[PDB]
């Protein structure tokens, strides 16, 4: 029942008298009952990665053996809440303790049991109806954005013996009783799930729909899909946290879980400050986006061993909302911090390191965590379809992408939004390096583009061609200069500069460029590529003639049109309607056509 | 057969990562198979990594999570891992441990074969001289594969090595002057990759002749230690006993090497380069060297491992030690992939060490060896000329350097580039090679004997 603390080397405690303690079991170390998880078990002694600071823990302190694994309470009350690494509601902690800190060993409930939730049972269900894991046996009106589907726990099944009538029920009241093989199971709205076990699904369907971020370079050149796995390597200050938050604010995911695993706490405070103000329109009514966002915060100075739990808790929450039929998006604020936490715990265990000190199982852990992302055909009787788009930022030390964490991540993630420090220093945000970055979902998304944005795939291909050609010409120019450049090479360079400065880069802290709808992302590219086509046509077709049109002639004649193309980004999706923006882009195209005709 | 009752020990003495150290074991047998019943009834399996007196360091395939001392029951099977093998293993899908995951029954053993394999006497191993017309001109033309060869696909993250492997699988065939049975061992492949390969096999109608071993990313990472051997064992049974021309694909030897490193670090062994076990060469060789033909038999085992080079580094211990064993390597380039070429096979660092004896008159054609040599020489000179141009500028390039650059461009545009569903016979590949060599004058094709230049150049 009780082990006894034997030693303490940091986040890692040792404990005697734990003969039958299972691996990765959850124990309470010390008199304050700091949560911890067994990670090795030698003889009758166990060793525990403690998810709270172990300072002040003395040998002989009790270690209670809770015969359960690290698990999360899943049920109504998650959305809009900010939890810590081990799912304690930080708002509830602050209200209960009336202190600005997080007491060590505080044991507040993950989901409040006092709130009366509006519960409406599934109409078809009756006494004596066969129900199984993942079946939705009720809906809880959590808020305006989220209809929290109440589902049987996976690995639960039987014949219904009592289904509660519609009404106001708290998270502790019994809502559904069923029986199987005679044994009777009672179920409230809350289900406890181990965080390290993948929540089952009937099938993992292929990813086929874009995860529309607010960023042009990500939406157009390197698309992500609903259910894909993404990475955002980049040095400090490159903008991966801002990309994560912009995806959290403006995206087509019905739910978003922000995991803040080992990063600043001011960033979590900023999320809490901004999201309640931000709103999205549902059925013509503005509703806050915090009503669908759940934060799992474990800042850099909070216990290191908790970071791992954070990640796991995050994904589990995502999986829970994936099983309802929602397209969850999990932002792992920094998986590099999780890898560093694993490295510290390994060092305390005196394990043999892999590359650069990381444990030999880092790649396996990352792969197993990223494998939980795909779009799925959720469990249960009602046929549904969820997703968990894992966007995991990486923080390579020294900005070197050879980092073991970054290298292991790139071998798992299908999309790679590598960020460049040089572009960030120039304030070229988003700092995505269009050359090295890639997305392995473009062929899976052409099916959707050809039917919704039929004109976009060739524009994307031509834009990437222009950028690659400009890269080659810049490599040449750096050593030889622009004197010997062919005129079409000058046009390639100048349109590539236009695309870089005025299409790819997008100031995310402005009323017009915070969100760039895909109609804008495609209209701007269409106009720039059209200008490229017209300039190249003029130059090539007048090379033989005496009236040789060059880049300089175009620039002098088309200064106003070039400035209009540069300022195309300033169109406001909200202040100026979609129709107005499309009409203005069409008018700019007409101006370009007329000016080129008057030039030739 | 083993009639003596097995011994079940509740004497687990320690758990450390993937390892479960037991004590008080009656005459431990090295490499013995153990069955661990967890407290909650979950049954796992493991292999005795080492024995010391009454101790036994079992290595659990499914992972040690949930195992506790005083309650886990390790029943020692008394024998090494002998996998069941049957001809009906073709058209089946098994997990990394060989259990069905296609909702079929467990394998009804035609025989029980040791996964470690039975070493083959070199005196009676036939030298493979039959070319495999994979249909990929970058492989057929310049790095040809001989039936019975070991030739990996070196690539990195994000490159189309899976697509190249699928193309080879669906196009592999002998040169026309016996269809391949595919055995697949996926180790650490995400769901997307496993689904891609399975759908590719079903669509192409070959599933009746395909046996898949899937160890996805979410699956246990010590299981993939046995996943390749299992596959190879089946291949051997199909090849040296059922007389089937087998083609063995091993998706990620990098993931297998990572599993090896995990077990080694758990064992606290003296590490090799980058933390990999000092014995990675021998463990990799025991897998690669199971290809080839043998005397008296009619079947063969063509082996095409696939490697994900970390940081694109061909000097990394995994690709390095794979080059030392396998006969060549097909090298997928990141630069070619970025430039939208497919297949992105860079023919400079890749080679096939059994190409010389597989090509030539009677096998494919008289000019094959010379055409390949001259294409390689021109490609290398063109790459050097490109490197020089990047520094000094094109205006300083001579006429011959411009010819080399034109050859390089048309070579990556016409020879290397190829549709994913286009299989170019070796003769079409050689015709394309000649059309590219004709860019240069005969005086510049130094590596082609005049007897062949006078016969093939003027056309």
């Amino acid at each position: 029942t009780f082990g006894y603390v034997h030693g303490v080397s940091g986040p890692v405690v040792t404990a005697c008298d734990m003969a039958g303690a299972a691996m990765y079991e959850l124990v309470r170390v010390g008199h304050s009952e700091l949560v911890g998880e067994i990670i090795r078990l030698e003889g009758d002694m166990a060793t525990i990665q403690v998810y709270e600071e172990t300072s002040g823990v003395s040998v002989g302190d009790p270690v209670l053996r809770t015969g359960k694994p690290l698990s999360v309470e899943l049920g109504p009350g998650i959305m809009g809440a900010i939890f810590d690494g081990i799912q304690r509601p930080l708002s509830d902690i602050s209200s209960q303790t009336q202190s600005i800190y997080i007491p060590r060993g505080v044991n507040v409930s993950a989901l409040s049991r006092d709130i009366k939730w509006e519960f409406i049972p599934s109409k078809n269900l009756r006494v004596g109806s066969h129900i199984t894991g993942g079946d939705i046996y009720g809906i809880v009106n959590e808020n305006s954005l989220i209809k929290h589907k109440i589902m049987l726990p996976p690995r639960s099944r039987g014949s219904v013996t009592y289904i509660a009538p519609p009404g106001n029920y708290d998270a502790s009241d019994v809502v559904l009783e069923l029986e199987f093989e005679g044994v009777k199971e009672k179920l409230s709205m809350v289900q406890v799930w181990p965080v390290r076990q993948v929540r089952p699904v009937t099938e993992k369907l292929p990813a086929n729909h874009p995860l529309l971020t607010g960023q042009r370079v990500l939406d157009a050149l390197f698309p992500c899909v609903q259910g894909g796995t993404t990475a955002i390597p980049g040095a400090f200050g490159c903008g991966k946290t801002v990309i994560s938050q912009s995806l959290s604010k403006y995206s087509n995911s019905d739910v978003i879980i922000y995991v803040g695993c080992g990063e600043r706490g001011n960033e979590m405070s900023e999320v809490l400050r901004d999201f309640p103000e931000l709103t999205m329109e549902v059925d013509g009514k503005v509703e806050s986006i915090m009503k669908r966002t759940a934060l799992v915060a474990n800042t850099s100075n909070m216990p290191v061993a908790a970071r791992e739990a954070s990640i796991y808790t995050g994904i589990t929450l995502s999986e829970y909302f994936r099983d309802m039929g929602y397209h969850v998006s999990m932002m792992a604020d920094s998986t590099s911090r999780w890898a560093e936490a694993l490295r510290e715990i390994s060092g305390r265990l005196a394990e043999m390191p892999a590359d650069s000190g990381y444990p030999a199982y880092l790649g396996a852990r990352l792969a197993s965590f990223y494998e939980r992302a795909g779009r799925v055909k959720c469990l249960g009787n009602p046929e549904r379809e969820g997703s968990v788009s894992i966007v995991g930022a990486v923080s390579p030390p020294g900005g070197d992408f050879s980092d073991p964490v970054t290298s292991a991540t790139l071998g798992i993630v299908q999309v790679f939004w590598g960020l460049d420090k040089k572009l960030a220093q120039r304030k070229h945000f988003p700092s995505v390096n269009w050359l090295i970055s890639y997305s392995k979902y473009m062929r899976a998304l052409d099916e959707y583009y050809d039917k919704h944005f039929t004109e976009f795939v060739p524009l994307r291909t031509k834009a990437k061609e222009i950028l690659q050609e400009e890269e080659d010409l810049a490599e040449i120019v750096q050593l030889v200069g622009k004197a010997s450049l062919a005129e079409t090479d000058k046009i390639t360079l100048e349109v590539a500069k236009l695309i870089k400065d005025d299409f790819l880069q997008q100031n995310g802290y402005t009323p017009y460029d915070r969100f760039c709808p895909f109609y804008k992302t495609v209209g701007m590219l269409s106009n720039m590529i059209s200008f490229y086509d017209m300039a190249r046509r003029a130059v090539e077709t007048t090379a033989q003639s005496d009236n040789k049109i060059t880049w300089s002639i175009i620039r002098e004649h088309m200064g106003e049109i070039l400035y209009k193309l540069s300022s195309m980004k300033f169109k406001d999706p909200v202040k100026d309607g979609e129709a107005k923006i499309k009409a203005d882009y069409a008018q700019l195209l007409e101006d370009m056509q007329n000016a080129f005709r008057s030039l030739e | 057969y083993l009639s003596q009752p097995r011994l079940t020990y509740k004497t687990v003495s320690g758990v450390n990562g993937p390892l479960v150290i037991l004590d008080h074991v009656k005459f431990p047998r090295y490499a013995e198979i153990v069955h661990l019943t967890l407290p909650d009834g979950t049954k796992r399996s493991g292999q005795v990594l080492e024995v010391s007196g009454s101790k036994a360091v079992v290595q659990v395939f499914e992972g040690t999570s949930g195992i506790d001392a005083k309650k886990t029951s390790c029943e020692f099977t008394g024998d090494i891992l002998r996998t069941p093998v049957s001809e009906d293993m073709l058209g089946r899908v098994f997990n990394g441990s060989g259990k069905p995951i296609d909702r079929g029954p467990v394998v009804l053993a035609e025989d029980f074969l040791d996964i470690m394999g039975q070493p083959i006497n070199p005196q009676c191993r036939i030298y493979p001289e039959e070319m495999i017309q994979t249909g990929i001109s970058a492989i057929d033309g310049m790095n040809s594969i001989a039936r019975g060869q070991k030739i990996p696909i070196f690539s990195a993250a994000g490159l189309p090595h899976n697509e190249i492997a699928a193309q080879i699988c669906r196009q592999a065939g002998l040169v026309k002057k016996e269809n391949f049975a595919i055995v697949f061992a996926a180790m650490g492949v995400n769901m997307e990759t496993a689904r891609f390969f399975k759908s590719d096999f079903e669509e192409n109608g070959s599933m009746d002749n395909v046996c898949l071993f899937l160890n996805l990313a979410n699956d246990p990472t010590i299981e993939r230690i046995i996943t390749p051997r299992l596959a190879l064992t089946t291949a051997e049974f199909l090849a040296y006993q059922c007389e089937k021309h087998v083609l063995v694909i091993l998706t990620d030897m990098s993931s297998y090497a990572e599993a090896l490193r995990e077990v080694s670090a758990a064992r606290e062994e003296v590490p090799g380069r980058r933390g990999f076990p000092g014995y990675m060469y021998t463990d990799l060789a025991t897998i690669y060297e199971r290809a080839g033909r043998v005397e008296g038999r009619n079947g063969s085992i063509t082996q095409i491992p696939i490697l994900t080079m970390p940081n694109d580094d061909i000097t990394h211990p995994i690709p390095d030690l794979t080059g030392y064993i396998t006969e060549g390597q097909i090298y997928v380039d990141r630069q070619l992939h970025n430039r939208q070429i497919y297949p992105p096979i860079n023919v400079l660092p890749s080679l096939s060490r059994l190409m010389k004896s597989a090509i030539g008159e009677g096998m494919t054609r008289k000019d094959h060896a010379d055409v390949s040599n001259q294409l390689y020489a021109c490609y290398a000179i063109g790459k050097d000329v490109q490197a020089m141009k990047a520094v000094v500028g094109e205006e300083a390039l001579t006429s011959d350097d411009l010819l080399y650059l034109e050859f390089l461009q048309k070579f990556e545009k016409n020879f290397i580039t190829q549709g994913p569903y286009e299989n170019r016979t070796v003769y079409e590949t050689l015709d394309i090679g000649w059309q590219l060599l004709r860019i240069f004058p005969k005086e510049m094709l130094k590596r082609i004997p005049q007897s062949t230049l006078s016969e093939f150049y003027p056309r």
Partner: peptide, 19 residues
């Protein structure tokens, strides 16, 4: 160097265990 130092420490501990 770190790996070799760790191996040396483990060898010393094992020698003490045997003694």
């Amino acid at each position: 160097f770190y790996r070799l130092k760790k191996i040396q420490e483990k060898k010393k501990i094992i020698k003490e265990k045997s003694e």
